[PDB]
Amino acid sequence: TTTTGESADPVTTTVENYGGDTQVQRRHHTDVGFIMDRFVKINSLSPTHVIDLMQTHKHGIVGALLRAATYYFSDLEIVVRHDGNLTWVPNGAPEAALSNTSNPTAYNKAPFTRLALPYTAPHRVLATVYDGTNKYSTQLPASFNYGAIQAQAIHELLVRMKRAELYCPRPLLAIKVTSQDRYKQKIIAPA
Amino acid sequence: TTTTGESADPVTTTVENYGGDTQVQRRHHTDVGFIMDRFVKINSLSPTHVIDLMQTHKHGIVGALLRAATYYFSDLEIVVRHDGNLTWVPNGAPEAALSNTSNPTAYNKAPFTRLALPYTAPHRVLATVYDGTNKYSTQLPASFNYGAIQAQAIHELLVRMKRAELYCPRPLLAIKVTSQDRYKQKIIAPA
Amino acid sequence: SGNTGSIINNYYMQQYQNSMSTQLGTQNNDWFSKLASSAFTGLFGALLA
Amino acid sequence: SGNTGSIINNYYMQQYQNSMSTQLGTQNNDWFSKLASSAFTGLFGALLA
Amino acid sequence: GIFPVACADGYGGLVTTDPKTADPVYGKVYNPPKTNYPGRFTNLLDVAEACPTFLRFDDGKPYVVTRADDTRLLAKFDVSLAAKHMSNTYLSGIAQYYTQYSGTINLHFMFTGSTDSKARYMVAYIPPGVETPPDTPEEAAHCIHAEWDTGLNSKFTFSIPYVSAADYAYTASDTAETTNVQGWVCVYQITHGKAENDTLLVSASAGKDFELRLPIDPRTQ
Amino acid sequence: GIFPVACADGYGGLVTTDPKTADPVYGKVYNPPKTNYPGRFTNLLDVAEACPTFLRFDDGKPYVVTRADDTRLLAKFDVSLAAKHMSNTYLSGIAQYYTQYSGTINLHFMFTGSTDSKARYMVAYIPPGVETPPDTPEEAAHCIHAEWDTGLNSKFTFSIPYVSAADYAYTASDTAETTNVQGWVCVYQITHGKAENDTLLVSASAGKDFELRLPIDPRTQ
Amino acid sequence: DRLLTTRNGHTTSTTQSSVGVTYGYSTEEDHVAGPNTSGLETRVVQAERFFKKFLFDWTTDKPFGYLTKLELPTDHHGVFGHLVDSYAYMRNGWDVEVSAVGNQFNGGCLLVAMVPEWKAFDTREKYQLTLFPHQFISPRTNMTAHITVPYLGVNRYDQYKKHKPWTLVVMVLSPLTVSNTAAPQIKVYANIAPTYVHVAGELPSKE
Ligand SMILES: O=C(O)[C@@H]1O[C@@H](O[C@H]2[C@H](O)[C@@H](NS(=O)(=O)O)[C@@H](O)O[C@@H]2COS(=O)(=O)O)[C@H](OS(=O)(=O)O)[C@@H](O)[C@@H]1O[C@H]1O[C@H](COS(=O)(=O)O)[C@@H](O)[C@H](O)[C@H]1NS(=O)(=O)O
Ligand SMILES: O=C(O)[C@@H]1O[C@@H](O[C@H]2[C@H](O)[C@@H](NS(=O)(=O)O)[C@@H](O)O[C@@H]2COS(=O)(=O)O)[C@H](OS(=O)(=O)O)[C@@H](O)[C@@H]1O[C@H]1O[C@H](COS(=O)(=O)O)[C@@H](O)[C@H](O)[C@H]1NS(=O)(=O)O
């Protein structure tokens, strides 16, 4: 098929053009809500930690995919391996509140704590990139977070996006290829 | 709107006065029963402890709110971290009864004991302040309590108000402001 | 209720789970709700819009 | 949903398990699905098969 | 056989705000009746709407005094639940326990002068976007404002509207904030006739759509 | 008595992709409305179909240049989501997170020359089974191919068919692979008239039956 | 004939080499009367007209990847500019027309796109810029590109002095080619019009 390409109108040809038969597709694994729904780890940690999905690694399946969207929304689940008790506080809270027990506080139970937390930002949607001239009264507004946690020590933090919604796609890149033809690597095979 | 203010009749204007649109409100978080329904800690403890909600801290969310009411009523839940077995006894009992096992006694089970206890005072409602010339045959009648607990050692005590009812509101104060304009503090923000 | 979010009905009977209220006569004895709803919202006097 | 495969209904109420969405007006506001389905599939011009 | 069960890791711990209930141990207790006990309140915002409390001005007074000189700005304050002027209100007392708010806040002005004291006032909401609030009624006129005079009715009520970028605003203020994020309110005195040393009491209450969400326990303990 | 239960060994552990949900601790939060927010996408393949992105040729250009000499092969590349030429496409960006694929991949050719520049091209799918791809239109004619010329419509689209032994093919390529398992695509220039230095942009998009299965997290972290 | 005449207020623009209009992310605006402005917002139709801006000179030496950007809103000296200094909050979409007139004997191709929340793109990311609302300009086919986009962002209303949601980008996809019969270079211009302009929060005067 030939078309006026300058218009940018989508064109999808099929093998029928030269005698083939287009087949059946099952696209469950490329479903946004499904694919974002798995735990991902946050590497940097500290006794006091503000939950920010952008601390996710840029090349991990979740972090790559999240960054391939401009705006997003989701609820959250967290797994925290910590010493002592864990206190969570919602978006907008004074850092000092983290010391108070009446905020959701999970008492230590081995081996870690799994929790379901609601979206809690004052915005209708959040962004992975924000073109602010400043945004004050490569930096993101401080209001873009899912609250904060505190314990005597935070050893590990996994985070899971629930009911994820993604808007306005952005570039997603594969590994840079050096070889003359294909990027080759060791694929699993029996001994 | 102008009115006769000396009458003290409530007046609630809206933005419609100058062309605005009043919006929709969802007030679940300011619901009394909901807000008082969370664990709060009691700092002073001892092997023998008489449960008194006024031992709650005056600036904590529960203690501040409770003190912002004259009379109240509620059932209770307690979490106790203790050595040995825990015995509870209802309001009006001889302190000596605490040593007897036939009163509700929870055998030690790690990491602590959670219990549901009923209101047990001889009054229809309790008070946070009591204007007694004396009240005998800044002090509250001894009958204002939820019973008492005893163990070999009591390390921690959390208390939770269930089915709370609050009557006749009293002053509730924010932090005293020193600054020329606003009380500013460190609000959580991502790193 | 307030801050209880379990779907399943309680394993223990109500007379054990809570103290039982008695009456002499939970109704609409909400003074402050009445007070707030009674607030004047109009505009005293004539208007020129 | 997406990546939840439990048969049994949740023990906790929805207003606890998740944040609650509000509206002003989940519908078919799927721009990219529309865009993709609108793609031209034919053949511009005359055919000789 | 018996029913197999998987005891799941990461579940089971006590969370101080959990939605479950404890197991009972002492049953069958009937309470003294408290049918129709007076003064009950079920939502903090009902009392916050019905009972306005006072703002704090100058050296600790619930009022503003009419200026004898040619300066017309009587007061200026941050539209913030954490503002110094709101620090003694019941509204700010409740607000400190929540992370976000939205909606209308109402201001009440009650003139206290003698029958032979007269005045004309103006209140304006200065939204954010300007560096400093105007100290002149003429400059503030371009904002949302209301003017009223003295007479038989001693009180005047005005609604500070919620106008912001996000749907909710923080109740607390961050240390990195120079200018108040939600703007200011300016009270002016257009003129007066023999009203020197006469007072204007100002109080605040929650409006019909005022809303507080996300409970928090922030005070030092 | 109470209900007997067997706490089973080997069950209960946290699996990062498990199909369960955590227990909640902070209820009753209502979100700001986001009704009808623009640009939403629910499946990665909808955008992969609607938005073709560019292939990479020679020294890093999204196009191929018409040859002035007597060599007619403009480009040759592996039908592989891991091919150097596909390395900057959105299609390969998504594909790296899946182990297998199947279906149609579409190529788009947009001529960029002036009105007085004309040419005739040919694209062929060389299936596996031959040692090296043909550098001649005459040899490649025996394969599935399409020829088109220049004119009013600047773009031409061709479907690379999925023809393989197994029902699915790997998205990644093993180090032990000499020849590309799925064959090659060869773009030729039959002739041209005054088209020296004129360009042919080439991009790719997912076809109607393109499919990706088996999610994977392979990048070094 | 591919004639299109666009009208915005008392200003009109017509091309005879139109390749159509590209709508990005949506065909309409979301709700302009949300809870964040109470009911105080108003539409100001007088700001809905075309203003102009020079972009760059498309020359033979500018290679693939060369890119010029224009963050919106930009400096404006008409009613729209006044609106920005007079109101605390605003929202509007954009109706964008970009012209690169040379002649039919030139070659090459420009990619014109509208990007939400701009970030400086890698040269590798430049291969996927078509993921954003766009259109192309190739001398053999057209001289005008036209894109229409709605207002968007984490906030229903904005403070343009602190944030710019949209940014127009024109990138060289294939270098300009010239001959004896062609135009030696092509100047690229933008004809922009803000759409559905709404303001809220009257600001005080400077006096
Ligand atoms: O230092 C102050 O802020 C002074 O405090 C106010 O008194 C408080 C009192 O401190 C408080 N007791 S507590 O132990 O702190 O809890 C309680 O009794 O309330 C009163 C009233 O406080 S209120 O918030 O103002 O309502 C003084 O008021 S009063 O004593 O007349 O009742 C208040 O006037 C004082 O503030 C002045 O001093 C401030 C700092 O002091 S210093 O410069 O270090 O010496 C200064 O910042 C204030 O501007 C000034 N008030 S002014 O408006 O008259 O200038
Ligand atoms: O070494 C290369 O591959 C050179 O890389 C390309 O530049 C990358 C850049 O490295 C990358 N930054 S990052 O830190 O690696 O992430 C990012 O900025 O993207 C650019 C573009 O990469 S792309 O995948 O080609 O799109 C050079 O492109 S550019 O700088 O013009 O933008 C690319 O031309 C380079 O590849 C050349 O060198 C390769 C190995 O270098 S050496 O022999 O060891 O000295 C060689 O294998 C390539 O064949 C050669 N490219 S050629 O086609 O012009 O011959």
Which domains does chain E possess?
A: 1-221 (2.60.120.20)
C15 Cβ contact list (under 8 Å, min separation 6): E27, E28
Closest CA to B118 of G187, C19, E67: C19
Chain A residues touching residue F212 (CB < 8 angstroms): 27, 29-30
Q: Exposure pattern of E1-37 as b/e (b: 16+ CB <10 Å)?
A: eeeeeeebbbeebbbbbbbebbebebeebebeebeeb
Evaluate: CB of F62 within 6 angstroms of ligand 2: no
Torsion sign over Cα E84, E87, E89, E93: positive
Number of domains forming the structure of chain G: 1
Structure token digits, residue E141: 């006129």
E127/G202 Cα distance (integer angstroms): 7
Name the residue type at position E126: I
F197/F117 Cα distance (integer angstroms): 10
CA atoms within 13 A on the CB side of F194: 11
Q: Which stretches of chain E are DSSP H helices?
A: 44-50, 90-95, 137-140
B46/F166 Cα distance (integer angstroms): 74
Q: How far is the CA of G123 from the centre of ligand 1 (A)?
A: 61
Instruction: Identify the H or E element spanning A115.
Output: strand A113-117
Number of domains forming the structure of chain C: 1
Neighbours of G120 (CB within 10 A): 8
Closest CB to C39 among E30, E43, E50: E50
State the smallest CA–CA distance between residue D1 and chain F in angstroms.
11
Asked whether E86 and E62 are in contact (CB, 8 A), the reply is: no
Closest CA to G122 of F123, F193, A176, B29: A176
Are B60 and A100 a contacting pair at CB < 8 A? yes
State the smallest CA–CA distance between residue G32 and chain D in angstroms.
10
Asked whether G187 and G98 are in contact (CB, 8 A), the reply is: no
Q: What is the per-residue DSSP string for G16-30?
A: SB----EE-S-SS--
Q: How far is the CA of E62 from the centre of ligand 1 (A)?
A: 14
Residue with tokens 């500018």: G62
Scanning B23-62 for CB atoms below 8 A from E yields: 23-33, 35, 38-39, 57, 59-61
G185/A78 Cα distance (integer angstroms): 58
Residue with tokens 């080997």: F10
A53/A65 Cα distance (integer angstroms): 12
Pairing outcome for strands F73-78 and F118-126: unpaired
Q: What is the CATH number of the domain that holds D10?
A: 4.10.90.10
Q: Tell whether F47 lies on the interface with G, counting CB pairs under 8 A.
A: yes
Neighbours of A147 (CB within 10 A): 26
Asked whether G157 and G166 are in contact (CB, 8 A), the reply is: no
Closest CA to F215 of B51, A32, A149: A32
HEC-encoded secondary structure of G45-113: HHHCCCEEEEEEEECCCCCCCCEEEEEECCCCCCHHHHHHHHEEEEEEEEEEEEEECCCCCCEEEEEEE
B27 Cβ contact list (under 8 Å, min separation 6): E43, E45, E211, E212
CA atoms within 13 A on the CB side of A145: 23
Q: Is residue G40 classed as helix, strand or coil in its secondary structure?
A: coil
Pairing outcome for strands F5-7 and E3-5: parallel
Number of domains forming the structure of chain B: 1
The dihedral formed by the CA atoms of B15, B18, B19 and B21, expressed in degrees to the nearest 10: 0
- Residue G143, CA distances (Å) to B94, C43, F24, F112 in order: 97, 61, 58, 14
F187/F129 Cα distance (integer angstroms): 19
F152/E85 Cα distance (integer angstroms): 72
Structure token digits, residue F120: 């005739």
Closest CA to A72 of A185, A167, A178, A174: A167
Q: How far is the CA of A178 from the centre of ligand 2 (A)?
A: 8
Q: Is residue F123 classed as helix, strand or coil in its secondary structure?
A: strand
- Residue B185, CA distances (Å) to A94, B59, G105 in order: 7, 17, 66
Structure token digits, residue G37: 């402005």
Candidates G36, G38, G41, partner chain B, best to mutate (most B CBs within 10 A): G38
- Residue E48, CA distances (Å) to A93, C36, E85, E107 in order: 22, 9, 17, 12
Asked whether B35 and B61 are in contact (CB, 8 A), the reply is: yes
Are G35 and E102 a contacting pair at CB < 8 A? yes
F88/D46 Cα distance (integer angstroms): 35
Q: Tell whether B163 lies on the interface with C, counting CB pairs under 8 A.
A: yes
Closest CA to E25 of G10, F192, B75: B75
Phi then psi for residue B103, to 5 deg, are -85, 155
G127/F87 Cα distance (integer angstroms): 10
Q: Is residue F93 classed as helix, strand or coil in its secondary structure?
A: helix
Length of chain F, in residues:
221
A95/A87 Cα distance (integer angstroms): 11
Phi then psi for residue B78, to 5 deg, are -135, 145
HEC-encoded secondary structure of G149-167: ECCCCCCCCECCCCECCEE
Are A107 and E13 a contacting pair at CB < 8 A? yes
Closest CA to G201 of G142, G160, G148: G160
Candidates A48, A100, A135, partner chain B, best to mutate (most B CBs within 10 A): A100
Q: How far is the CA of G169 from the centre of ligand 2 (A)?
A: 24
Asked whether D6 and F19 are in contact (CB, 8 A), the reply is: yes
Evaluate: CB of E85 within 6 angstroms of ligand 1: no
Asked whether E99 and A91 are in contact (CB, 8 A), the reply is: yes
Ligand closest to CA B59? 1
By the 10 Å C-beta count (0-12 exposed, 13-18 middle, 19+ buried), F138 is classed as exposed
Evaluate: CB of B176 within 6 angstroms of ligand 1: yes
Chain A residues touching residue G138 (CB < 8 angstroms): 6
Neighbours of G75 (CB within 10 A): 8
Tell me which DSSP letter residue A60 carries. S
Pick the residue whose CA is nearest to atom 10 on ligand 2: A176
Structure token digits, residue F187: 């773009």
Pick the residue whose CA is nearest to atom 46 on ligand 2: A178
Strands of E66-220, DSSP E: 73-78, 98-102, 105-111, 118-126, 144-149, 155-160, 169-170, 173-174, 184-193, 199-206, 211-215
By the 10 Å C-beta count (0-12 exposed, 13-18 middle, 19+ buried), A36 is classed as buried
E55/E64 Cα distance (integer angstroms): 10
Closest CA to F173 of F101, F103, F88, F90: F101
Closest CA to F32 of C6, G66, D20: D20
Asked whether G76 and G169 are in contact (CB, 8 A), the reply is: no
Scanning A56-115 for CB atoms below 8 A from D yields: 75
Chains in contact with C via at least 3 Cβ–Cβ pairs below 8 Å: B, D, E, F
E184/E177 Cα distance (integer angstroms): 14
Q: Tell whether E19 lies on the interface with D, counting CB pairs under 8 A.
A: yes
- Residue E122, CA distances (Å) to B99, E95, E128, F3 in order: 70, 27, 19, 73
By the 10 Å C-beta count (0-12 exposed, 13-18 middle, 19+ buried), C11 is classed as exposed
Containing structural domain, residue B55: 1-191
Closest CA to B27 of G155, E42, G206, E74: E42
> What is the side-by-side strand order in the sheet with F118-126?
F73-78, F184-193, F118-126, F144-149
E101/B36 Cα distance (integer angstroms): 19
Q: What share of chain B is helix, strand, coil (3-state, %, to 5)?
A: 15, 35, 50
Asked whether A75 and A91 are in contact (CB, 8 A), the reply is: no
Q: Exposure pattern of B112-129 as b/e (b: 16+ CB <10 Å)?
A: bbbbbbbbbbebebbbbe
Structure token digits, residue A179: 């070889």
Torsion sign over Cα B142, B146, B147, B151: negative
Phi then psi for residue B50, to 5 deg, are -90, 120
F112/G139 Cα distance (integer angstroms): 8
Closest CB to B188 among A44, A93, A102: A93
Closest CA to F158 of F127, F128, F195, F185: F185
Asked whether E81 and E204 are in contact (CB, 8 A), the reply is: no
Neighbours of E179 (CB within 10 A): 17
Euclidean distance between the first and the last CA atom of chain B, given in angstroms as a whole number: 48
Phi then psi for residue G100, to 5 deg, are -130, 80
B64/E98 Cα distance (integer angstroms): 13
Q: Which residues share a beta bridge with F77?
A: F185
Q: How far is the CA of E75 from the centre of ligand 1 (A)?
A: 19
Evaluate: CB of G124 within 6 angstroms of ligand 2: yes
G8 Cβ contact list (under 8 Å, min separation 6): G48, G49, G50, G95, G193, G195
Name the residue type at position E66: T
Method: X-ray
Q: Which residues share a beta bridge with E102?
A: E211
Q: What is the per-residue DSSP string for B35-98?
A: HT-S-EEB----SEEE--GGGB-TTSHHHHHHHTEEEEEEEEEEEEEEES-EEEE-TT--GGGG
Candidates B75, B113, B183, B188, partner chain E, best to mutate (most E CBs within 10 A): B183
Chain E residues touching residue A101 (CB < 8 angstroms): 16, 217
Closest CA to E121 of E111, E135, E134: E111
Closest CA to E43 of B81, G190, B26, B157: B26
Q: Tell whether G163 lies on the interface with A, counting CB pairs under 8 A.
A: yes
Asked whether E87 and B177 are in contact (CB, 8 A), the reply is: yes
Pick the residue whose CA is nearest to atom 30 on ligand 1: E60
Q: How far is the CA of F59 from the centre of ligand 2 (A)?
A: 8
B173/E87 Cα distance (integer angstroms): 8
- Residue G165, CA distances (Å) to A135, A140, A168, F39, G55 in order: 12, 14, 12, 14, 19
Max intra-chain CA distance, chain F: 95
Residue with tokens 């109607």: F208
Closest CA to E211 of G203, A140, D22: D22
Resolution of the structure in the document, Å: 2.0
Evaluate: CB of B178 within 6 angstroms of ligand 1: yes
E208/E199 Cα distance (integer angstroms): 28
Chain G residues touching residue B21 (CB < 8 angstroms): 33, 38-40
Evaluate: CB of F59 within 6 angstroms of ligand 2: yes
G52/E177 Cα distance (integer angstroms): 37
CA atoms within 13 A on the CB side of B131: 2
Measured in whole angstroms, the distance separating CA F211 from the mean position of its chain's CA atoms is 11
State the smallest CA–CA distance between residue B161 and chain C in angstroms.
11
Spell out which chain F residues touch chain B, with contact meaning CB-CB distance below 8 angstroms: 28, 30
Tell me which DSSP letter residue F208 carries. T
Q: Which stretches of chain A are DSSP H helices?
A: 32-35, 61-67
A37/A31 Cα distance (integer angstroms): 10
Structure token digits, residue E42: 């079920």
Name the residue type at position G137: I
E76/E188 Cα distance (integer angstroms): 9
By the 10 Å C-beta count (0-12 exposed, 13-18 middle, 19+ buried), G27 is classed as exposed
Containing structural domain, residue D12: 1-49
Torsion sign over Cα A55, A56, A59, A65: negative
CA atoms within 13 A on the CB side of G130: 32
A32/A163 Cα distance (integer angstroms): 9
Chains in contact with B via at least 3 Cβ–Cβ pairs below 8 Å: A, C, E, F, G
Q: Tell whether F16 lies on the interface with D, counting CB pairs under 8 A.
A: no
Asked whether E102 and E168 are in contact (CB, 8 A), the reply is: yes
Pick the residue whose CA is nearest to atom 39 on ligand 2: A178
By the 10 Å C-beta count (0-12 exposed, 13-18 middle, 19+ buried), E199 is classed as middle
